[PDB]
Amino acid sequence: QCVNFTTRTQLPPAYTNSFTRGVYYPDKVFRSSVLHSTQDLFLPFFSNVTWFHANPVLPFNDGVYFASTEKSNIIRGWIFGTTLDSKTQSLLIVNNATNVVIKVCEFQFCNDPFLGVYYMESEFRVYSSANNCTFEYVSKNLREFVFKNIDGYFKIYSKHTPINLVRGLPQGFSALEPLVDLPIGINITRFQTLHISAAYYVGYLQPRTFLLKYNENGTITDAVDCALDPLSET
Amino acid sequence: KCTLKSFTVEKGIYQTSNFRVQPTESIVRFPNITNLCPFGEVFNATRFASVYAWNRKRISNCVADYSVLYNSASFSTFKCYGVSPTKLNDLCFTNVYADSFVIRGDEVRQIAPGQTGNIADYNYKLPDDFTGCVIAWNSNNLDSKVGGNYNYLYRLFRKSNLKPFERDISTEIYQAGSTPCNGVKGFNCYFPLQSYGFQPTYGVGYQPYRVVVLSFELLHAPATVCGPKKSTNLVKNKCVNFNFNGLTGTGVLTESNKKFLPFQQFGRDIADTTDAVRDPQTLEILDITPCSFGGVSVITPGTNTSNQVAVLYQGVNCTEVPVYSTGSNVFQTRAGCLIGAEHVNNSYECDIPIGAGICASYQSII
């Protein structure tokens, strides 16, 4: 139950720096006061991040780092898939106050998918039909997410932080805890973002090597990119 | 003597072998069993569909206990073809297909690979390479009606047979002859669908029988559906071997005060060696220590002089010694545990070095 729109809002994307953000726990192993070197997919330090202020179909690549410095839980939904139609399986995620609800099948999306709020919210018109599927899963503020798809497994890492700075990303370090895992194998190459009724930062992941420090309580407090400059390599 | 491969031994200390504390028992632990597959709604359904319209259900991502289906004696026919059922609790596949219908008593044998019949050729055909199981049980008290239950229909005529895993519910008028029919029966046109006449007065072989067929699929997606894994009790302060959720190894389990973040499952210190683990049931942090082991040595004053020896266990506390379990006065030293030599409180020159500043000599052995 959706139609087209006339206010074709297209704000060109700006570019910003990444600083030292985009670090997550690679595994579920406790380590105390140790420097561990690991090779995996991370967001390189001091990279270029695409700032968006409608929403285009951005390619997924290997993984995606998605940040939103929003107020009062604006950013809600996520769409993943290859063709985003009834021809191929599609993935939809809706974030709520408690947790995220996930559905995996071919929902038929239109040009302007949005959830809609009624003033007590009751509206759902992102798609039109869904024939067959099996997997449904139910479980001021800067929200950081990392989305990965490795060998038939969909991984979502999340972190919430309070920030007061307005213009750019905070200059601090905070590891990302593992949040959600799905044992589903579906090819995904593109993803989108749901509209509401709004600025966000997007970055890509690359395979490289990092050095991580674990304190006495098993929390990551420092990370070093090996292949950045001669001092870091040393 | 055997180690030296000689019949004479001169005075000194020699390393013969080594010992280790054997494990006592085995313990395996797994998280609490949950997410059982909904088998009740299939085998206890109010009614089943027709044989030509057999109902299909997909089962994935749940634990399926086949023991309850095995030990039930209410199933008149329980025939598993592809594999022996007893091992489905161990090995498993990625998907399950359940086909439910109702057939006559004499049609039970037709549900098998390499079988032919009206149902086997016009209603449901199974390939010779089919793997799975079939469960058929009488439902005379429910499906059969005193006035004649015609709610079940079966195909009677078709030009060709049915492909494996193919469902056809077409109501096209079968044309046996060459005279076309425009939707009306005639001399050579008959309705392929016939209604069953199940009644309580019908004898054996005519009573309605509910049949459910389970098939297993192993698509490249990871396997998710099979029986639960049993768990055992937990013991402490004993060198045993453990199988904590796939993490297998021996050692002694003690209590630990280390703190884990709520998303880890086990920890390690350095060189990738397990140090602590959290049990998946009570969610507490234990501690793993390798139970004691070490080499042994024999101190002798020479075969020519005497024929008695002393035994030294290197770096082993004098609490777990085990025929030489008592011997003489047992002495505990920093180097290890000494058996067969008494301890004096004098001080002379060193003859056969032992370690940690002490050594023994022959007077008995002191």
Add this chain to the structure above:
Amino acid sequence: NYNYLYRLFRKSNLKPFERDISTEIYQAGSTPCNGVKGFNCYFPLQSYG
């Protein structure tokens, strides 16, 4: 010909170069056999068609 026969049920595996001709009922299920096949018990030896 039904003079050819082979075992198909057994409690466990066989050691190398070992022959067993024990013609005893097999307790396939949890129901005890007590010398009668009934249910969950079958003859371990089957012939050749």
